[PDB]
Amino acid sequence: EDTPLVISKQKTEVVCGVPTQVVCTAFSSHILVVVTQFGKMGTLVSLEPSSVASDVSKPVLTTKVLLGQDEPLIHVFAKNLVAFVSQEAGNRAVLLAVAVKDKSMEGLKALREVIRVCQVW
Amino acid sequence: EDTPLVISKQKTEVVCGVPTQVVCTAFSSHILVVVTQFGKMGTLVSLEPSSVASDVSKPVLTTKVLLGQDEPLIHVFAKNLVAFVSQEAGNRAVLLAVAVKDKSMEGLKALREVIRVCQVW
Ligand SMILES: [K+]
Ligand SMILES: [K+]
């Protein structure tokens, strides 16, 4: 027997032909989101609500690549993949591990649907 | 129903009076180890096998604090907590999320025992 201290949910789903496992875990000040294809951990991105820029209505979601190649697309993709998680979880920081080599709008929408199935906030 | 793509195991155990959840997940090039108390994600540390120093028998396990306060004890503690994971998993990198405020040798040994219960390598 076991009783978790934090809520986690996972789901394996095919996304644009690729089996993909999603895991979401709710910590008090972070949601950890894992999106893994082909057994790989991929790129680790922190998404931190930060000081407003021109729009004072909502925090800026600042991205940092912590592990893996720091290249510009993954920052933008990560924001579109999990900004909704941060927002819905009370403007909480998100730690994302993302291993998705072949990206598209169709795939992005499908990944967000799996993350929604794994909602823990 | 569901079928994971990566092996994960978790356990909640009391360690020196504190309920602690451990999760280990095996990716092809990383073991992700979560050690959480009080619902917190804590400090994120990467432990990367790296170029030898004076002892040529084994890689150096280089630590980097990726999220949380970068202070010297957590580097050393992290190495003693999960070096065995890296070694046993084929000198694999480890990504550690560790939220343990009150550290001791007794507690360190007990945490390693929980990580062993959650072996995924
Ligand atoms: K990948
Ligand atoms: K902590």
Author numbering:
A (entry chain A), B (entry chain A): 2 to 122
Original paper wording:
There is considerable evidence that the assembly of the eukaryotic 26S proteasome does not proceed spontaneously, but is mediated by several assembly chaperones. The formation of the 20S CP is assisted by five proteasome-specific chaperones: PAC1–PAC4 and POMP in humans; Pba1–Pba4 and Ump1 in yeast. Recently reported knock-out experiments indicated that α4, α5, α6, and α7 form a core assembly intermediate as part of the initial process of α-ring assembly, which is supported by PAC3-PAC4. In summary, we produced structural insights into the functional mechanisms of the PAC3-PAC4 heterodimer as a molecular matchmaker underpinning the α4-α5-α6 subcomplex during α-ring formation.
